[PDB]
Amino acid sequence: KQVSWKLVTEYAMETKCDDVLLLLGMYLEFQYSFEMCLKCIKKEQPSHYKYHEKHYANAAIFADSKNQKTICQQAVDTVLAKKRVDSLQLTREQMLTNRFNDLLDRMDIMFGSTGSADIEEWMAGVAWLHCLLPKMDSVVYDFLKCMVYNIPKKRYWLFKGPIDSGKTTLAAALLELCGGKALNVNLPLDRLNFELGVAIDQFLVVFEDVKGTGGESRDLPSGQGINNLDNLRDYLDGSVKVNLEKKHLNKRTQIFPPGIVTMNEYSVPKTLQARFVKQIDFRPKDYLKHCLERSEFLLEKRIIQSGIALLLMLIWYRPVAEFAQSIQSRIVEWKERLDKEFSLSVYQKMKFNVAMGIGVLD
Amino acid sequence: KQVSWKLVTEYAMETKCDDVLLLLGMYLEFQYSFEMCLKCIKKEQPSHYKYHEKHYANAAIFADSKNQKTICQQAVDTVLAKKRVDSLQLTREQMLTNRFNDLLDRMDIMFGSTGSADIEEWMAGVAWLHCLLPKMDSVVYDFLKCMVYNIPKKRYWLFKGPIDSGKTTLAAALLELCGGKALNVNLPLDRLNFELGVAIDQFLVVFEDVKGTGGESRDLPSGQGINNLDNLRDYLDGSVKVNLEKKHLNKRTQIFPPGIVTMNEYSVPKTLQARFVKQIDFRPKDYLKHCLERSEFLLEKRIIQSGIALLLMLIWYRPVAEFAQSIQSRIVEWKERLDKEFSLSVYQKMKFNVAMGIGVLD
Amino acid sequence: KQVSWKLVTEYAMETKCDDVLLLLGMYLEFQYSFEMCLKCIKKEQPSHYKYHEKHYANAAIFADSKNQKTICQQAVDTVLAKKRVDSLQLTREQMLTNRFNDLLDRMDIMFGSTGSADIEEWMAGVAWLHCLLPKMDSVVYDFLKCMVYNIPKKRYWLFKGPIDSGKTTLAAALLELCGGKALNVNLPLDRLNFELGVAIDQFLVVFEDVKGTGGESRDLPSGQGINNLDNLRDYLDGSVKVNLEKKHLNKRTQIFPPGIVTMNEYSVPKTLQARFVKQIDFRPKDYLKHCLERSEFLLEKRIIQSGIALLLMLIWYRPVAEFAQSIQSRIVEWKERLDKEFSLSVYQKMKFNVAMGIGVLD
Amino acid sequence: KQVSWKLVTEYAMETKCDDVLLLLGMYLEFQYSFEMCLKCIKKEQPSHYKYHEKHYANAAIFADSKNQKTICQQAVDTVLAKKRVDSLQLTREQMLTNRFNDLLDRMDIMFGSTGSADIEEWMAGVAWLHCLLPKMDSVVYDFLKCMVYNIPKKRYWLFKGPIDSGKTTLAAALLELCGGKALNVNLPLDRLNFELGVAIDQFLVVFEDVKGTGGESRDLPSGQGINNLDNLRDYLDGSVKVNLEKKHLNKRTQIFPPGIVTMNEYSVPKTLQARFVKQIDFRPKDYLKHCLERSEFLLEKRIIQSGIALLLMLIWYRPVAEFAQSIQSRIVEWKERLDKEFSLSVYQKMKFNVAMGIGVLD
Amino acid sequence: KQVSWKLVTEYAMETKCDDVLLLLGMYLEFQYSFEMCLKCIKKEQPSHYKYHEKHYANAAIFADSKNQKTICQQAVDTVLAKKRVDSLQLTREQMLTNRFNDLLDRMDIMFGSTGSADIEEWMAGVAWLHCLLPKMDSVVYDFLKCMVYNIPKKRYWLFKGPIDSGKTTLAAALLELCGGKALNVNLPLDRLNFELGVAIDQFLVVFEDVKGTGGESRDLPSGQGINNLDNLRDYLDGSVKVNLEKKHLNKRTQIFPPGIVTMNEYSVPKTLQARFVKQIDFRPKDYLKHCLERSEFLLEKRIIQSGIALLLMLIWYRPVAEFAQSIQSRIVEWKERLDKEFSLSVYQKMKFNVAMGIGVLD
DNA sequence: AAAAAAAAAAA
DNA sequence: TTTTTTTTTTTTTTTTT
Ligand SMILES: Nc1ncnc2c1ncn2[C@@H]1O[C@H](COP(=O)(O)OP(=O)(O)OP(=O)(O)O)[C@@H](O)[C@H]1O
């Protein structure tokens, strides 16, 4: 009997693999009988233990086949095809709603009885993040609206300030929340073509620690980054479609994604300053440093850097009426859950600990 | 039964798909049964609900197939072949007529009973654009006729002015109205070969935001853009054919399109400036900014950069004797529809609102 | 009868061949008869004598085949697919535990009755290394813990001091222990992209002898390294996924590996110094030099740089509970072996010899 | 039945088509019944209406085939192969016989169709150039034959005069007649090699504005051009093959092209002056400068520079024996158009008005 | 019958062809009949006359085939696969042992009845070389041992002396004996990386004529070479692995080869002087110069540059037991042959003739 | 030289 | 047509700066 290419494509769709080697590796695990399969018995990874019993019969035939990489290539192109259809046909609010659904699915596993996480650690993260900026939850909500409306020349935000002020921490959390890529523009202009091509079909991009000039009077080293962004200011505008490039592929014509620029305090030419809607000045705070020294699990487990921490901040602080109607059902259920496992008394205690520089937990 | 490759080519020719991945994604949607299709009963996108009933029988067989990307590649090449036949065999006025017939079909769907658009916002769009330049509708009509004549050495218009002047918004509207591509020529000369290859078979080219050198006392950072256009001199003149390149596909020899060049107030070489037939100078106007702040629905729905807004300007201001003969009858239909919806007193009120800097629609 | 592609994939998986030409070369050795096989009689290389009996039948058929490279290519992709699945799905503890199992398998070959090595010469290396830094085994243990936890911005160590001070000796030993690669960031900036591409899917990276400007009055050469390294701030941090490239391959998005910087006495920017957790000052001290003049065998056999010397140092000095539970069984068998053919009275005499500056062995 | 690839190859050779997508598109037009065919009945394009009836049967079978691009690329290779067989065996007079047919096909755009500027002001262009130099039309034919014979040492012509001498206009006109390219030799010696390498595989060259040594006493800006060109004697004389370099490519060996040198009244060194066959002085004429002030369309429709006007001069004045046997019929077929449209008196009026310093009248 | 791919793979392995076109050319010569074959009768090339008789039948069928390049590709792959297995698994002693009996095969052909080499002239070369340095055969034997043992920091030699002293003569002879390649480190430091990439998988490298910077007052040109070697400390020392780069190929990691540095009477920094295990001083000698004038055949046949002359020197002067056991029997046969053709009185007469310049063979 | 996809052989 | 099998060519990288 022959291999069903359909069953492989169906597995790739359910798991969202866009890598041929990953898909080949995963599917070849299903050769062995599930009756004795140690990974299924341990329940270590969901993309194995859910699917092995369904795919065992087909994977045994697949391991005898001669054209295995061709089968996987067709499946990966099917996933990339759906991804491109969805980029052209969905509204940006639906794309964000789909992303929140994915995060909530991961939260159900992570805080379920098979999961590792304790919510007290994650909500201690919410408390630490809310101390970072005045009205943090309003800032996060204002950012989400800005990325959904995608208004020409009113698209990009600037994070500015000295070393260890939290720019990258908040930027990385917002990048996971929305889904997107970080780009390095400090490289010289010639190979910048293939860097920018990483942005194809992405929802956000972040430009990380762009270097300027003249900062040597403050002991900041010079570089090409700000000069390079001046050359790309039609990509920042978003009024008109730009041409984006991958090695050995022809150019994709699309409007470039919105997002965040992170900077140390170099001077910004007025031509770029005209592209930025809002500047957030980060400043370092002594009590936040003292707190992370006592509560190091926040850095080991990457809690303050996670999008799930910012999603929990939104679930806690925002009215239900600010979410899309499809997910309001799931978010009322998650508010009910958080209302059991916390009280305002525990959360206010956590905030008071952080302002004193004490450990978050007690 | 076997797959019909002809049916896939019919779907692709009816939909005008240039992308193999997009065509694959859309045709795979048809594998699910028509009797229950949620997108057919909600009528989300016409490229689905018009065609799914016809194609369900064939898409079931296509989903089992091993050749899927090869089938789509031949369908995409059939559509690209038609574009090359039409580009060489049609007159430029017939091409512009075909562009307007597609824009008007889009307007019929957009302002129909199924439509979402509100025409008062779009005619406020016309009013805002008419304030941007004196005798705007004559500037638009001169451009359209200039691009249809395409006389060698008199093919390019220069848009010049400071950091916020409206030059990009007007170029973007003309680009949708005429069709074309925007190109970035601030990058080094080496990789421009594949950038210029995007101009193959197009009607217009827009060279956006060409950086100059000197004028630095204005606080404009310098760059290679103007030096690159001092090269490429024969592409602008168009008195000769050029070779255009794209990856793996064989190169094509054609006369390069006409276009628009936008730049901030850099000093321009005389050898370049000799090749532009017209300069339009753009000035900041304080009242236009106050107007958009109070009427931001114009930016959210991208009305002031849409080609449809310039076509509605042309329908309103120009006589039917200035349009082509085949399109007369539907322009007569639209021009009566517009006089039925708007009293001239409403348009006069709108234009007075914009000059007064109050919100339009107030 | 026809060639089994399954047996070739099995041999490649057992041997871990990810080079197509090496696999082809190895497998074509099996076409000759097992009985007369001089390599099975001498027992030189284990990759031959363990497997020839099993694969003889299939290798004879493979030698008559017309598509030998197509067969080998699939096997090499199967091995790379396992490697990419393991990178995405294993914990860093498991990765390190697997690496220790591989080194212990090597040690069983080196010190078994077919092997060439003498345990007392390797153990002299441990004594010389334990004299290089104070509390050396705590330093090696702290490093492994740091590389496993991979805490953001707290994950690089700096080795700093004069020339001939032991930096690259120790760094090379740590590199073989953890597995990873050494990078030269002193290159010109446009070569630097492919130099950073060496790090893809590695556990550890080491930056060898980075040079700066200034300090030239100390007779230090000048160089670009520190300037380049300060463009790469976000690669060191590990907060976001960087985009890594190889020649002719599309960009891989992943978190950059942690590791070590080795440096002469330049000054360093605060932007970089904020990214190092620990600075270890290496000082030259002449008893170690006079020792190595007299105990030359340490240099000649490469014992002093090898990771197996550090692993032996961890087995001699650390409690058994500090190793992962799967490997504790082998480590107590090795502690028994070392206590049986080596003694504490010998070890303190070896260390006394090194401190006295005299040849280590009796 | 099955597709005849030979019939497709015959169509490609009869239409002389060397684009694979263009061939695919035009051949797919033949799949419809010729009894009904609107493009035939409208007689729009010869590449359709002649061939449809013959190719209809094959085109219907071709539309069902799965390998359509394979069929078309064999046919395009057949046309490219014929072109290379001819080109490698081409005499230099057959090269010019080909070059002027392309310019004639461009003039057949103003023949019998409104798609062009009015010829009456282009004959004023013929007249105005015939007033620039004594016996202008004989200068053109002597120059043409000089370039066709390629006689060593007898190959370069020198044009001298101040600003506003017309030398650049006639240099442009002669260049655009013949299809060479223009080179700049004012560069420092380090850069000349890539400038000279532009001349590869090319019919003519022009050297523009070679700035001399000294000349400030005539208010002429000094440069290296004359001094450089004196060093290029082996390129100018044309007896031996020079090696020429394009950027990134390997060298080619050929005999360097003939053509034109243009100068202000700098001093020409005797060693360089001996290499020019003929010096033509251009001198400013006040009556021409008044005429062109009174007849702006000469410059603003680019009549005087466009080298097509020099063929339009050769058309009328010159005998029939002065043209090759394969185009003698085609010129007299063209020439009777002007014999019907014009008279000696109106051309004498054109000349007279120019000589009087007024625009053409009556 | 049908082509045996196995017989072609044998021929490629026996000839060691890693070039597909060379193999294709060689194998197609075998289609013509053996009985009449002029190349076999004249015995011009051993790669033909040995094998033609065996392969005639397969070559006749191969000449009719359609797959000819694919058969040759697989055969070339088989040869390259063996080279990589041998590179990764052989001891350095087996590598040199294989290189010697490869040279003994060349010696057999040269000095056989079919050959063209006069052993009296080659033995005169051995005499002239033995007079170049004191204890020459021990110098050569010590060098071989040093390169085989590859002991870190005891693995580079320095050759120093005036121009025309014999340095590249001896260095070139040692390269042919061991195998290896020459390197030019006088390039600027940013062009050096592809030059160092020549060393990949080589047994030796020679640094040819490194120039110093000071000492110009002795008429010695200034250059970068020794300053570049000071920077490459870690490549020479050989304790740790380095990354090496070929054009278009990914970086490979290995311990850089041992070798020779050759220089004029430049000043050496003391840091570099400590990296050489030995320094050999070459001084011009008049009697060798006057001998070479009378014994010109040494230069004209390139005898004194060749590795075969050094191998004849080791065969003549060294005891049998210090060659590897596989080659001892072949060297005993060669010792018998040489003692048959030469007595000690003839050889000491040749040394006596050199020492006073009368001319070796008199 | 490797990757994307084409192009062909035998039942 | 189906399955198994064989083949092409270019871009990128280098070169250039
Ligand atoms: N506002 C803050 N005040 C004090 N310490 C902070 C603050 N934000 C972050 N930290 C600490 O500093 C570490 C680094 O933070 P982060 O990298 O986000 O800063 P950054 O301002 O973006 O830095 P850089 O300019 O180096 O990119 C965090 O892991 C945390 O321990």
Ligand SMILES: Nc1ncnc2c1ncn2[C@@H]1O[C@H](COP(=O)(O)OP(=O)(O)OP(=O)(O)O)[C@@H](O)[C@H]1O
């Ligand atoms: N004439 C104008 N006066 C004042 N504000 C203007 C004017 N035209 C446009 N604006 C404002 O400037 C914004 C940007 O307009 P636009 O993109 O056309 O500017 P531009 O001059 O082309 O810019 P750039 O020089 O950056 O390419 C608009 O969205 C609007 O808010």
Ligand SMILES: Nc1ncnc2c1ncn2[C@@H]1O[C@H](COP(=O)(O)OP(=O)(O)OP(=O)(O)O)[C@@H](O)[C@H]1O
């Ligand atoms: N602490 C030390 N004191 C004295 N000699 C030392 C010391 N450590 C190493 N050595 C000697 O110095 C030699 C070189 O050591 P090593 O390569 O580790 O130096 P390094 O300073 O780290 O080098 P680099 O900066 O060039 O990588 C060793 O082989 C040993 O002989």
Ligand SMILES: Nc1ncnc2c1ncn2[C@@H]1O[C@H](COP(=O)(O)OP(=O)(O)OP(=O)(O)O)[C@@H](O)[C@H]1O
């Ligand atoms: N004989 C003439 N007398 C006066 N004016 C002339 C004459 N011929 C041409 N002109 C006008 O003078 C202009 C400048 O001359 P032209 O274009 O030939 O450049 P040029 O004389 O080579 O000068 P430059 O060295 O400045 O480029 C022409 O374009 C035309 O308008």
Ligand SMILES: Nc1ncnc2c1ncn2[C@@H]1O[C@H](COP(=O)(O)OP(=O)(O)OP(=O)(O)O)[C@@H](O)[C@H]1O
């Ligand atoms: N010791 C010597 N004394 C005199 N003449 C010599 C001696 N060795 C070589 N010769 C002659 O000098 C020529 C040049 O020798 P060789 O190529 O070795 O020169 P080198 O100056 O030492 O090398 P390099 O140019 O690489 O530094 C030889 O071909 C030979 O004719």
